[PDB]
Amino acid sequence: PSRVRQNFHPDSEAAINRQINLELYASYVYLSMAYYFSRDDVALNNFSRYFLHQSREETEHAEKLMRLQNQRGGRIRLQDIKKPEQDDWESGLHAMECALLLEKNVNQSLLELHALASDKGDPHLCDFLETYYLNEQVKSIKELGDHVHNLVKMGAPDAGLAEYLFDTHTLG
Amino acid sequence: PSRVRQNFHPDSEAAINRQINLELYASYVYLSMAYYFSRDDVALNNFSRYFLHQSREETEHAEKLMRLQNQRGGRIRLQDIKKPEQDDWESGLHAMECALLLEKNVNQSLLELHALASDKGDPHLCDFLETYYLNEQVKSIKELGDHVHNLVKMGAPDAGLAEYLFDTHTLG
Amino acid sequence: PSRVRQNFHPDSEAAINRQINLELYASYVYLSMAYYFSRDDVALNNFSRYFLHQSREETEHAEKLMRLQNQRGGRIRLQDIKKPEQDDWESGLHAMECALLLEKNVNQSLLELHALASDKGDPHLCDFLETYYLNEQVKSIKELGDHVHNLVKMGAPDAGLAEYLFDTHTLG
Amino acid sequence: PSRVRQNFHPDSEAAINRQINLELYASYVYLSMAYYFSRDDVALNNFSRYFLHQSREETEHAEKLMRLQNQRGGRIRLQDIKKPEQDDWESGLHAMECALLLEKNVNQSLLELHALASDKGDPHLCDFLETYYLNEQVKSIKELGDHVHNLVKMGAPDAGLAEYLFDTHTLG
Ligand SMILES: [Cl-]
Ligand SMILES: [Cl-]
Ligand SMILES: [Cl-]
Ligand SMILES: [Cl-]
Ligand SMILES: [Cl-]
Ligand SMILES: [Cl-]
Ligand SMILES: [Cl-]
Ligand SMILES: [Cl-]
Ligand SMILES: [Cl-]
Ligand SMILES: [Cl-]
Ligand SMILES: [Cl-]
Ligand SMILES: [Cl-]
Ligand SMILES: [Cl-]
Ligand SMILES: [Cl-]
Ligand SMILES: [Cl-]
Ligand SMILES: [Cl-]
Ligand SMILES: [Cl-]
Ligand SMILES: [Cl-]
Ligand SMILES: [Cl-]
Ligand SMILES: [Cl-]
Ligand SMILES: [Cl-]
Ligand SMILES: [Cl-]
Ligand SMILES: [Cl-]
Ligand SMILES: [Cl-]
Ligand SMILES: [Fe+2]
Ligand SMILES: [Fe+2]
Ligand SMILES: [Fe+2]
Ligand SMILES: [Fe+2]
Ligand SMILES: [Fe+2]
Ligand SMILES: [Fe+2]
Ligand SMILES: [Fe+2]
Ligand SMILES: [Fe+2]
Ligand SMILES: [Fe+2]
Ligand SMILES: [Fe+2]
Ligand SMILES: [Fe+2]
Ligand SMILES: [Fe+2]
Ligand SMILES: [Fe+2]
Ligand SMILES: [Fe+2]
Ligand SMILES: [Fe+2]
Ligand SMILES: [Fe+2]
Ligand SMILES: [Fe+2]
Ligand SMILES: [Fe+2]
Ligand SMILES: [Fe+2]
Ligand SMILES: [Fe+2]
Ligand SMILES: [Fe+2]
Ligand SMILES: [Fe+2]
Ligand SMILES: [Fe+2]
Ligand SMILES: [Fe+2]
Ligand SMILES: [Fe+2]
Ligand SMILES: [Fe+2]
Ligand SMILES: [Fe+2]
Ligand SMILES: [Fe+2]
Ligand SMILES: [Mg+2]
Ligand SMILES: [Mg+2]
Ligand SMILES: [Mg+2]
Ligand SMILES: [Mg+2]
Ligand SMILES: [Mg+2]
Ligand SMILES: [Mg+2]
Ligand SMILES: [Mg+2]
Ligand SMILES: [Mg+2]
Ligand SMILES: [Mg+2]
Ligand SMILES: [Mg+2]
Ligand SMILES: [Mg+2]
Ligand SMILES: [Mg+2]
């Protein structure tokens, strides 16, 4: 094994590789959303900027896991990054609802990774997830929930002013 | 011929004179729109400012072509600047749609000028158009498309708040 | 069609979507290389930083094409980002040689895209490629060639000091 | 018991005293290494500085545990600090390999302390170890692994330039 490896189970190593792929996938979903909002027939520039920022954060999340793999003496194994489920995200509200579902799915994967790390007696990996992932996920889910609620109440997507006003006053 | 003239076809010289006239015409259309929006019964001051700025940019476009004519040893031949198709532009949305059509028409003229310059083996003129005109036109058309989409979705021109809110939040 | 679309052939639109995928693939290859060099049994931190920077530049290249698609009224169609050919890049020299091959392959794709844009009489797309892609590619290929030559002459990968010294004095 | 003591098992108190001794021992090992590298027949001043810094960090680690003992109402019980296994550390590579082994041994002790704290339902002590010790150890082990790899590849200790160049370019 790696001269650095200590208390690092092969199952944890493999689960970290799966998590890297999921974070890169989330990054790709958000990149797709960002450029949907800059279409000439959508043109919600602050929705675009919001999702572009989320995309870049997800790439940061992937990289921190790649660094962890190296720090612990595991070996990064990359896989294809699957394309997002849609190119046409329909509306600001629909994109927000899809982002909320994505974040809950990523959160579930992180909770499963934490349960594995616990089962394998890996407190370093548990602390890593708690310190950098789990609260970030809760904050992200709460923010998306807030945004979905306001858009629904405002009458998105059919009320003509709703996404326009939310773009300029919440995301601006 | 001019002591400076080199590789500059008379057909290119004539086409540049026609393009100067078209750019001055576009400037005049936008000047007309700017002052429509400052009527007491329209009073959308940021629509006014937006089109005034576009007017000044079109005069810049005309002048750069006039400079090119001199640089290449051609002779500027000015023609009447025709009045715009309307004085009453009806609404912010209608003005935006008319501006989009104008910009596409000017773009078509520039593409024809580029095809002529190509046919005449004039890479200086091709590069001039590519460097200063063609991307500017694509950016302008995209911006106008964005604005038309938002105004349509917001319910302009009949929805009482739409042009008012777009004036203050997009064009402000 | 899109209210913005003008002189933009469907074949160009499709070729731009393929180019976006290739640029994202190049970004992924370089990300893989960056993290190879931070393995405890490789530990060439400036090779790592160099390839991380190249990765981020390739994502910028993909995004500028995504923006072009929107600007011209085409529709972005994303595909899976295939995993790199290797996770273990063997040595600093091997990674540099693989990067050089990648860049030549991406360059060939851009030259084919330029030939298509020319065939379709799309001078905006030709200028876009010339302005932002073609010289960047030539500079990148030349830089990688320089690096490969120095590493070969220094005796990489087998000469114990070669990659270490190149890491600290060229890439540092 | 101490008026402050709460949820603090005597076995945890004793294990913290053993950990204090181990951290002071690690500090002493690194102090020995630092002064080996300043011998006139070794004279690798940046190896010296690197290990002196590590020595001071280990004393900080001991002190934070001494503070924890007081904070929790336990009583510090100091023991002899055993001398290091060697005074003559042989080479820069050998010292690095010995430091890596030491750090893995200290890490194993901290993981055992964390397992004890878990068994005793002491989440304060678990969090203390995770927050201040476990990631520090992983970072330290990874850094030492990196250094060992580069020194081995460079040909240390027998290749005349290897430790000299690593001293000046990595540790400088
Ligand atoms: Cl292990
Ligand atoms: Cl795969
Ligand atoms: Cl796959
Ligand atoms: Cl644990
Ligand atoms: Cl909100
Ligand atoms: Cl709700
Ligand atoms: Cl001539
Ligand atoms: Cl006339
Ligand atoms: Cl006339
Ligand atoms: Cl030519
Ligand atoms: Cl807009
Ligand atoms: Cl529309
Ligand atoms: Cl078209
Ligand atoms: Cl696909
Ligand atoms: Cl595919
Ligand atoms: Cl062309
Ligand atoms: Cl070089
Ligand atoms: Cl060579
Ligand atoms: Cl107690
Ligand atoms: Cl004792
Ligand atoms: Cl003793
Ligand atoms: Cl507990
Ligand atoms: Cl190192
Ligand atoms: Cl090694
Ligand atoms: Fe975020
Ligand atoms: Fe952020
Ligand atoms: Fe994430
Ligand atoms: Fe698929
Ligand atoms: Fe996320
Ligand atoms: Fe815990
Ligand atoms: Fe924690
Ligand atoms: Fe987030
Ligand atoms: Fe403009
Ligand atoms: Fe301007
Ligand atoms: Fe113009
Ligand atoms: Fe007339
Ligand atoms: Fe224009
Ligand atoms: Fe313009
Ligand atoms: Fe407002
Ligand atoms: Fe580069
Ligand atoms: Fe750069
Ligand atoms: Fe590229
Ligand atoms: Fe495959
Ligand atoms: Fe490239
Ligand atoms: Fe490059
Ligand atoms: Fe040097
Ligand atoms: Fe340290
Ligand atoms: Fe320090
Ligand atoms: Fe320590
Ligand atoms: Fe003894
Ligand atoms: Fe230590
Ligand atoms: Fe340390
Ligand atoms: Mg060994
Ligand atoms: Mg997966
Ligand atoms: Mg934008
Ligand atoms: Mg004369
Ligand atoms: Mg005319
Ligand atoms: Mg005014
Ligand atoms: Mg229409
Ligand atoms: Mg492809
Ligand atoms: Mg690094
Ligand atoms: Mg009392
Ligand atoms: Mg002991
Ligand atoms: Mg000294």
Swiss-Prot record, chains A, B, C, D:
Residues 6-155 form the Ferritin-like diiron domain. Fe cation 1 binds at E23, E58, H61. The lineage of its organism: Eukaryota, Metazoa, Chordata, Craniata, Vertebrata. It catalyses: 4 Fe(2+) + O2 + 4 H(+) = 4 Fe(3+) + 2 H2O. This is Ferritin, mitochondrial. Homooligomer of 24 subunits. The functional molecule is roughly spherical and contains a central cavity into which the polymeric mineral iron core is deposited. One of its GO terms (molecular function) is ferroxidase activity. Detected in testis and erythroleukemia. Expression is very low or not detectable in brain, colon, heart, kidney, liver, lung, muscle, placental, spleen and small intestine. Its main location: mitochondrion. It is found in: Mitochondrion. Keywords: Iron, Iron storage, Metal-binding, Mitochondrion, Oxidoreductase, Transit peptide. Belongs to the ferritin family. It comes from Homo sapiens. Its EC number is 1.16.3.1. Fe cation 2 binds at E58, E103, Q137. GO terms for biological process: intracellular iron ion homeostasis; iron ion transport; protein maturation. The keyword Membrane does not apply. Catalyzes the oxidation of ferrous iron(II) to ferric iron(III) and stores iron in a soluble, non-toxic, readily available form. Important for iron homeostasis. Iron is taken up in the ferrous form and deposited as ferric hydroxides after oxidation. One of its GO terms (cellular component) is mitochondrion.
